[PDB]
Amino acid sequence: HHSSGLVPRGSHSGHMTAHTLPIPDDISTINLTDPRTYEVNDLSEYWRQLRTTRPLYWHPPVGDAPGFWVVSRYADVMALYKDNKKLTSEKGNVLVTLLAGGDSAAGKMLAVTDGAMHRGLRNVLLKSFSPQALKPIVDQIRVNTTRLVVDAARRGECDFAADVAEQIPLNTISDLLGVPAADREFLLKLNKSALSSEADQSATDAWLARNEILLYFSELVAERRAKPTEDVISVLANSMVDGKPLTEEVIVLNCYSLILGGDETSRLSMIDSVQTFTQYPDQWELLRDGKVTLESATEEVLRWATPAMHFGRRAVTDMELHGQVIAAGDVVTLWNNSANRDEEVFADPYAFDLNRSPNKHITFGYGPHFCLGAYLGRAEVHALLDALRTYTTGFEITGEPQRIHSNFLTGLSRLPVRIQPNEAAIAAYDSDNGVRS
Ligand code: HEM
């Protein structure tokens, strides 16, 4: 097929804002560094061509940027994530930094640090991220998510992104950091301008906002040194690693990295689930009516959404893969989106199947840098699915969804929907007789 429908033909809604996308088959015509590529193409045939004929692919130089390896198979993606000896994240872990020749947070922030410092940081954070420790946070995810979904169902017409998804990950992360309730709005506005969101003034506002967030975290550090708590900021502030306390910069940058890593990806996954349910209403029905577990459904939403399309590395030494040499210094990119559609691992990979088993998707990565927040990411999706299945009977697209613009992340920033409330469920929620969520 030359083209594909953006909106599946079986969709229950969204048909009035459907558009077709080309399905490119000529590898040479695709520039992976261009964010527009991901919005103007259905890359399904492209990734299949790479997996089957060029599993290690040298993407050419674009502009002043170097070429880079593209790794498309699940087995190879998994194998390369595992190796932080011959590969490093210390020159950046995504295209923008990799192609720039580095990341100024290298050696300090988890995602761009390897060796003893990386293990030391992960080690200091282990207790904080245990399911036992995260129980109060998970409890509050349920309460918060239920409240948002109920309120949205009550109103009918909303933007699922702004009215539900936006208002969950930063609260989760704020709980985790120990950010006071009073500062969460304050923090929310900074985070929004710190990511893009466009021009000169937008780029200027982004770096200013990031700088203000680090300053604020620096203030909380100073408080937690004077008066320790059990939150992540305190843990980082009061820890030592290999005989030394962490520098102010290291603590603040890793606090921030929880927002960087957890906020947008969690939102994108949740937003994706709603669009996907309108596209595959049979799957929605299975979820709503209790015919698949939340656990199984959560994993398939994660595999389907794969919001972080790629992560990358740089070769420390020469390595061989597929009868080819990756040279010391070469950029290497690992495509999770392709891995999560690899038919060699996932039967019928373009089938959205809530009861999919097995489902060892690679949405959270693998190896030493495996997503620090994976348990929380899953809990947010799990809580959303539970809220949707309990308090709504269904929902429809009521306007055109808007894509984010990235060569790294993929998904929606806006999703206009009308939600059909489960009236009986909401009545019991509202009832004055002692049961909420
Ligand atoms: C569905 C949502 C999420 C997705 C798709 C996602 C994806 C990923 C992936 C693929 C990695 C590995 C990066 C690499 O190898 O370079 C990663 C790392 C990381 N994630 Fe997530 N993540 C999610 C949620 C979260 C949340 C909620 C948090 C915060 C609590 C978080 C914090 C981090 C941190 C700090 C790292 C770096 C860990 C390290 O380098 O050792 N993530 N994430």
PDB file of all heavy atoms in Angstrom, residues 150-176:
ATOM      1  N   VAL A 150     -13.400  10.981  36.926  1.00  0.00           N
ATOM      2  CA  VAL A 150     -14.763  11.261  37.349  1.00  0.00           C
ATOM      3  C   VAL A 150     -15.194  12.675  36.932  1.00  0.00           C
ATOM      4  O   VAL A 150     -16.262  12.835  36.331  1.00  0.00           O
ATOM      5  CB  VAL A 150     -14.981  11.021  38.862  1.00  0.00           C
ATOM      6  CG1 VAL A 150     -16.361  11.489  39.284  1.00  0.00           C
ATOM      7  CG2 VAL A 150     -14.790   9.525  39.194  1.00  0.00           C
ATOM      8  N   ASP A 151     -14.355  13.680  37.213  1.00  0.00           N
ATOM      9  CA  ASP A 151     -14.692  15.072  36.916  1.00  0.00           C
ATOM     10  C   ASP A 151     -14.910  15.272  35.407  1.00  0.00           C
ATOM     11  O   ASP A 151     -15.877  15.924  34.989  1.00  0.00           O
ATOM     12  CB  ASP A 151     -13.600  16.013  37.450  1.00  0.00           C
ATOM     13  CG  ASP A 151     -13.614  16.135  38.977  1.00  0.00           C
ATOM     14  OD1 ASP A 151     -14.583  15.680  39.623  1.00  0.00           O
ATOM     15  OD2 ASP A 151     -12.646  16.693  39.533  1.00  0.00           O
ATOM     16  N   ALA A 152     -13.996  14.719  34.613  1.00  0.00           N
ATOM     17  CA  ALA A 152     -14.082  14.747  33.148  1.00  0.00           C
ATOM     18  C   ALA A 152     -15.351  14.027  32.622  1.00  0.00           C
ATOM     19  O   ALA A 152     -16.054  14.556  31.763  1.00  0.00           O
ATOM     20  CB  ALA A 152     -12.811  14.154  32.522  1.00  0.00           C
ATOM     21  N   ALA A 153     -15.666  12.849  33.164  1.00  0.00           N
ATOM     22  CA  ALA A 153     -16.906  12.131  32.785  1.00  0.00           C
ATOM     23  C   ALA A 153     -18.163  12.933  33.086  1.00  0.00           C
ATOM     24  O   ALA A 153     -19.136  12.879  32.329  1.00  0.00           O
ATOM     25  CB  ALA A 153     -16.983  10.750  33.463  1.00  0.00           C
ATOM     26  N   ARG A 154     -18.138  13.663  34.198  1.00  0.00           N
ATOM     27  CA  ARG A 154     -19.246  14.487  34.660  1.00  0.00           C
ATOM     28  C   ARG A 154     -19.560  15.571  33.605  1.00  0.00           C
ATOM     29  O   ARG A 154     -20.720  15.785  33.229  1.00  0.00           O
ATOM     30  CB  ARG A 154     -18.843  15.132  36.001  1.00  0.00           C
ATOM     31  CG  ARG A 154     -19.892  15.127  37.055  1.00  0.00           C
ATOM     32  CD  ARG A 154     -19.478  15.968  38.256  1.00  0.00           C
ATOM     33  NE  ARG A 154     -18.563  15.289  39.182  1.00  0.00           N
ATOM     34  CZ  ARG A 154     -18.941  14.354  40.054  1.00  0.00           C
ATOM     35  NH1 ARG A 154     -20.203  13.953  40.087  1.00  0.00           N
ATOM     36  NH2 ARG A 154     -18.061  13.831  40.892  1.00  0.00           N
ATOM     37  N   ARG A 155     -18.500  16.209  33.114  1.00  0.00           N
ATOM     38  CA  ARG A 155     -18.577  17.295  32.128  1.00  0.00           C
ATOM     39  C   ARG A 155     -18.905  16.839  30.707  1.00  0.00           C
ATOM     40  O   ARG A 155     -19.455  17.603  29.928  1.00  0.00           O
ATOM     41  CB  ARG A 155     -17.240  18.039  32.087  1.00  0.00           C
ATOM     42  CG  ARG A 155     -16.932  18.849  33.328  1.00  0.00           C
ATOM     43  CD  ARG A 155     -15.451  18.877  33.588  1.00  0.00           C
ATOM     44  NE  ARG A 155     -14.698  19.438  32.469  1.00  0.00           N
ATOM     45  CZ  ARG A 155     -13.400  19.261  32.279  1.00  0.00           C
ATOM     46  NH1 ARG A 155     -12.697  18.510  33.125  1.00  0.00           N
ATOM     47  NH2 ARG A 155     -12.804  19.836  31.241  1.00  0.00           N
ATOM     48  N   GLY A 156     -18.536  15.609  30.359  1.00  0.00           N
ATOM     49  CA  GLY A 156     -18.658  15.146  28.982  1.00  0.00           C
ATOM     50  C   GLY A 156     -17.487  15.610  28.119  1.00  0.00           C
ATOM     51  O   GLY A 156     -16.448  14.966  28.095  1.00  0.00           O
ATOM     52  N   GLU A 157     -17.656  16.743  27.439  1.00  0.00           N
ATOM     53  CA  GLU A 157     -16.670  17.291  26.501  1.00  0.00           C
ATOM     54  C   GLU A 157     -15.433  17.856  27.191  1.00  0.00           C
ATOM     55  O   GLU A 157     -15.541  18.812  27.963  1.00  0.00           O
ATOM     56  CB  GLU A 157     -17.313  18.413  25.683  1.00  0.00           C
ATOM     57  CG  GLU A 157     -17.974  17.973  24.401  1.00  0.00           C
ATOM     58  CD  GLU A 157     -16.997  17.906  23.247  1.00  0.00           C
ATOM     59  OE1 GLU A 157     -15.801  18.207  23.448  1.00  0.00           O
ATOM     60  OE2 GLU A 157     -17.429  17.548  22.135  1.00  0.00           O
ATOM     61  N   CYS A 158     -14.257  17.303  26.887  1.00  0.00           N
ATOM     62  CA  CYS A 158     -13.013  17.821  27.458  1.00  0.00           C
ATOM     63  C   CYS A 158     -11.817  17.612  26.532  1.00  0.00           C
ATOM     64  O   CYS A 158     -11.961  17.040  25.451  1.00  0.00           O
ATOM     65  CB  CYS A 158     -12.766  17.211  28.847  1.00  0.00           C
ATOM     66  SG  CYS A 158     -12.267  15.488  28.866  1.00  0.00           S
ATOM     67  N   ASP A 159     -10.645  18.105  26.938  1.00  0.00           N
ATOM     68  CA  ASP A 159      -9.402  17.722  26.267  1.00  0.00           C
ATOM     69  C   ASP A 159      -8.746  16.737  27.206  1.00  0.00           C
ATOM     70  O   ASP A 159      -8.293  17.117  28.281  1.00  0.00           O
ATOM     71  CB  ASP A 159      -8.495  18.926  25.985  1.00  0.00           C
ATOM     72  CG  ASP A 159      -7.043  18.528  25.627  1.00  0.00           C
ATOM     73  OD1 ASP A 159      -6.733  17.329  25.408  1.00  0.00           O
ATOM     74  OD2 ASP A 159      -6.185  19.443  25.567  1.00  0.00           O
ATOM     75  N   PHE A 160      -8.693  15.471  26.805  1.00  0.00           N
ATOM     76  CA  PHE A 160      -8.161  14.464  27.708  1.00  0.00           C
ATOM     77  C   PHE A 160      -6.743  14.763  28.177  1.00  0.00           C
ATOM     78  O   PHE A 160      -6.404  14.466  29.321  1.00  0.00           O
ATOM     79  CB  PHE A 160      -8.225  13.051  27.128  1.00  0.00           C
ATOM     80  CG  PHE A 160      -7.696  12.012  28.073  1.00  0.00           C
ATOM     81  CD1 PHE A 160      -8.525  11.433  29.037  1.00  0.00           C
ATOM     82  CD2 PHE A 160      -6.365  11.642  28.027  1.00  0.00           C
ATOM     83  CE1 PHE A 160      -8.032  10.485  29.934  1.00  0.00           C
ATOM     84  CE2 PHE A 160      -5.844  10.687  28.939  1.00  0.00           C
ATOM     85  CZ  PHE A 160      -6.694  10.107  29.884  1.00  0.00           C
ATOM     86  N   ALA A 161      -5.903  15.300  27.284  1.00  0.00           N
ATOM     87  CA  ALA A 161      -4.525  15.699  27.640  1.00  0.00           C
ATOM     88  C   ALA A 161      -4.467  16.753  28.775  1.00  0.00           C
ATOM     89  O   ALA A 161      -3.827  16.537  29.803  1.00  0.00           O
ATOM     90  CB  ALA A 161      -3.813  16.237  26.419  1.00  0.00           C
ATOM     91  N   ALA A 162      -5.119  17.890  28.567  1.00  0.00           N
ATOM     92  CA  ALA A 162      -5.094  18.990  29.551  1.00  0.00           C
ATOM     93  C   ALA A 162      -5.848  18.677  30.845  1.00  0.00           C
ATOM     94  O   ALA A 162      -5.385  19.007  31.944  1.00  0.00           O
ATOM     95  CB  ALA A 162      -5.631  20.300  28.929  1.00  0.00           C
ATOM     96  N   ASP A 163      -7.008  18.044  30.712  1.00  0.00           N
ATOM     97  CA  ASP A 163      -7.935  17.894  31.841  1.00  0.00           C
ATOM     98  C   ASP A 163      -7.679  16.650  32.714  1.00  0.00           C
ATOM     99  O   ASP A 163      -8.127  16.588  33.868  1.00  0.00           O
ATOM    100  CB  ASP A 163      -9.369  17.881  31.325  1.00  0.00           C
ATOM    101  CG  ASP A 163      -9.774  19.208  30.676  1.00  0.00           C
ATOM    102  OD1 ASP A 163      -9.275  20.274  31.088  1.00  0.00           O
ATOM    103  OD2 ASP A 163     -10.609  19.193  29.758  1.00  0.00           O
ATOM    104  N   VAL A 164      -6.993  15.660  32.149  1.00  0.00           N
ATOM    105  CA  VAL A 164      -6.688  14.442  32.889  1.00  0.00           C
ATOM    106  C   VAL A 164      -5.190  14.143  32.891  1.00  0.00           C
ATOM    107  O   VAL A 164      -4.575  14.154  33.944  1.00  0.00           O
ATOM    108  CB  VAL A 164      -7.483  13.217  32.377  1.00  0.00           C
ATOM    109  CG1 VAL A 164      -7.116  11.956  33.169  1.00  0.00           C
ATOM    110  CG2 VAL A 164      -8.982  13.466  32.475  1.00  0.00           C
ATOM    111  N   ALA A 165      -4.609  13.886  31.724  1.00  0.00           N
ATOM    112  CA  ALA A 165      -3.237  13.399  31.670  1.00  0.00           C
ATOM    113  C   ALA A 165      -2.190  14.367  32.248  1.00  0.00           C
ATOM    114  O   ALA A 165      -1.305  13.941  32.982  1.00  0.00           O
ATOM    115  CB  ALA A 165      -2.863  12.987  30.254  1.00  0.00           C
ATOM    116  N   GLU A 166      -2.298  15.652  31.926  1.00  0.00           N
ATOM    117  CA  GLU A 166      -1.354  16.664  32.427  1.00  0.00           C
ATOM    118  C   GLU A 166      -1.283  16.705  33.953  1.00  0.00           C
ATOM    119  O   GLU A 166      -0.239  17.017  34.527  1.00  0.00           O
ATOM    120  CB  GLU A 166      -1.732  18.058  31.918  1.00  0.00           C
ATOM    121  CG  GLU A 166      -0.933  18.528  30.732  1.00  0.00           C
ATOM    122  CD  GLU A 166      -1.598  19.672  29.977  1.00  0.00           C
ATOM    123  OE1 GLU A 166      -2.153  20.599  30.621  1.00  0.00           O
ATOM    124  OE2 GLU A 166      -1.560  19.635  28.720  1.00  0.00           O
ATOM    125  N   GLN A 167      -2.394  16.389  34.601  1.00  0.00           N
ATOM    126  CA  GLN A 167      -2.529  16.635  36.029  1.00  0.00           C
ATOM    127  C   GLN A 167      -2.167  15.421  36.891  1.00  0.00           C
ATOM    128  O   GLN A 167      -2.466  15.417  38.086  1.00  0.00           O
ATOM    129  CB  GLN A 167      -3.940  17.169  36.345  1.00  0.00           C
ATOM    130  CG  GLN A 167      -4.283  18.507  35.628  1.00  0.00           C
ATOM    131  CD  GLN A 167      -5.695  19.030  35.926  1.00  0.00           C
ATOM    132  OE1 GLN A 167      -6.512  19.230  35.008  1.00  0.00           O
ATOM    133  NE2 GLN A 167      -5.985  19.269  37.210  1.00  0.00           N
ATOM    134  N   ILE A 168      -1.522  14.408  36.293  1.00  0.00           N
ATOM    135  CA  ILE A 168      -1.127  13.175  37.001  1.00  0.00           C
ATOM    136  C   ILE A 168       0.395  12.975  37.203  1.00  0.00           C
ATOM    137  O   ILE A 168       0.822  12.773  38.334  1.00  0.00           O
ATOM    138  CB  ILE A 168      -1.752  11.897  36.361  1.00  0.00           C
ATOM    139  CG1 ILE A 168      -3.274  11.893  36.545  1.00  0.00           C
ATOM    140  CG2 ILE A 168      -1.156  10.618  36.961  1.00  0.00           C
ATOM    141  CD1 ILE A 168      -3.984  10.916  35.622  1.00  0.00           C
ATOM    142  N   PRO A 169       1.209  12.997  36.116  1.00  0.00           N
ATOM    143  CA  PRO A 169       2.632  12.691  36.354  1.00  0.00           C
ATOM    144  C   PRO A 169       3.388  13.693  37.226  1.00  0.00           C
ATOM    145  O   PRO A 169       4.192  13.272  38.058  1.00  0.00           O
ATOM    146  CB  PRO A 169       3.237  12.615  34.939  1.00  0.00           C
ATOM    147  CG  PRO A 169       2.063  12.343  34.033  1.00  0.00           C
ATOM    148  CD  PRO A 169       0.907  13.089  34.674  1.00  0.00           C
ATOM    149  N   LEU A 170       3.145  14.999  37.075  1.00  0.00           N
ATOM    150  CA  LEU A 170       3.876  15.949  37.906  1.00  0.00           C
ATOM    151  C   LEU A 170       3.473  15.834  39.384  1.00  0.00           C
ATOM    152  O   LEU A 170       4.320  15.986  40.266  1.00  0.00           O
ATOM    153  CB  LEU A 170       3.794  17.393  37.382  1.00  0.00           C
ATOM    154  CG  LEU A 170       4.653  18.408  38.156  1.00  0.00           C
ATOM    155  CD1 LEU A 170       6.164  18.173  38.033  1.00  0.00           C
ATOM    156  CD2 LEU A 170       4.316  19.810  37.711  1.00  0.00           C
ATOM    157  N   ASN A 171       2.212  15.509  39.665  1.00  0.00           N
ATOM    158  CA  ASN A 171       1.845  15.196  41.061  1.00  0.00           C
ATOM    159  C   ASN A 171       2.528  13.959  41.628  1.00  0.00           C
ATOM    160  O   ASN A 171       2.942  13.964  42.784  1.00  0.00           O
ATOM    161  CB  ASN A 171       0.343  15.066  41.257  1.00  0.00           C
ATOM    162  CG  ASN A 171      -0.295  16.369  41.552  1.00  0.00           C
ATOM    163  OD1 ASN A 171      -0.053  16.978  42.611  1.00  0.00           O
ATOM    164  ND2 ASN A 171      -1.128  16.835  40.618  1.00  0.00           N
ATOM    165  N   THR A 172       2.617  12.904  40.819  1.00  0.00           N
ATOM    166  CA  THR A 172       3.313  11.682  41.217  1.00  0.00           C
ATOM    167  C   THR A 172       4.778  12.009  41.542  1.00  0.00           C
ATOM    168  O   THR A 172       5.292  11.672  42.627  1.00  0.00           O
ATOM    169  CB  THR A 172       3.238  10.627  40.108  1.00  0.00           C
ATOM    170  OG1 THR A 172       1.860  10.355  39.826  1.00  0.00           O
ATOM    171  CG2 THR A 172       3.936   9.355  40.533  1.00  0.00           C
ATOM    172  N   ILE A 173       5.418  12.709  40.616  1.00  0.00           N
ATOM    173  CA  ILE A 173       6.823  13.051  40.752  1.00  0.00           C
ATOM    174  C   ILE A 173       7.063  14.005  41.930  1.00  0.00           C
ATOM    175  O   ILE A 173       8.027  13.834  42.695  1.00  0.00           O
ATOM    176  CB  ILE A 173       7.422  13.538  39.387  1.00  0.00           C
ATOM    177  CG1 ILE A 173       7.237  12.445  38.326  1.00  0.00           C
ATOM    178  CG2 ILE A 173       8.914  13.799  39.514  1.00  0.00           C
ATOM    179  CD1 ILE A 173       7.203  12.978  36.900  1.00  0.00           C
ATOM    180  N   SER A 174       6.159  14.970  42.105  1.00  0.00           N
ATOM    181  CA  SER A 174       6.190  15.871  43.241  1.00  0.00           C
ATOM    182  C   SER A 174       6.050  15.149  44.577  1.00  0.00           C
ATOM    183  O   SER A 174       6.747  15.489  45.534  1.00  0.00           O
ATOM    184  CB  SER A 174       5.120  16.946  43.108  1.00  0.00           C
ATOM    185  OG  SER A 174       5.455  17.772  42.017  1.00  0.00           O
ATOM    186  N   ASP A 175       5.161  14.155  44.642  1.00  0.00           N
ATOM    187  CA  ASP A 175       5.061  13.315  45.837  1.00  0.00           C
ATOM    188  C   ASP A 175       6.392  12.631  46.096  1.00  0.00           C
ATOM    189  O   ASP A 175       6.876  12.615  47.219  1.00  0.00           O
ATOM    190  CB  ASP A 175       3.987  12.251  45.692  1.00  0.00           C
ATOM    191  CG  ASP A 175       2.588  12.791  45.914  1.00  0.00           C
ATOM    192  OD1 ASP A 175       2.431  13.985  46.281  1.00  0.00           O
ATOM    193  OD2 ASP A 175       1.633  12.005  45.722  1.00  0.00           O
ATOM    194  N   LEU A 176       6.970  12.081  45.032  1.00  0.00           N
ATOM    195  CA  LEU A 176       8.191  11.303  45.113  1.00  0.00           C
ATOM    196  C   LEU A 176       9.349  12.181  45.617  1.00  0.00           C
ATOM    197  O   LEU A 176      10.119  11.768  46.489  1.00  0.00           O
ATOM    198  CB  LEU A 176       8.470  10.705  43.727  1.00  0.00           C
ATOM    199  CG  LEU A 176       9.603   9.733  43.430  1.00  0.00           C
ATOM    200  CD1 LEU A 176       9.451   8.458  44.237  1.00  0.00           C
ATOM    201  CD2 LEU A 176       9.624   9.425  41.945  1.00  0.00           C
TER     202      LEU A 176
END
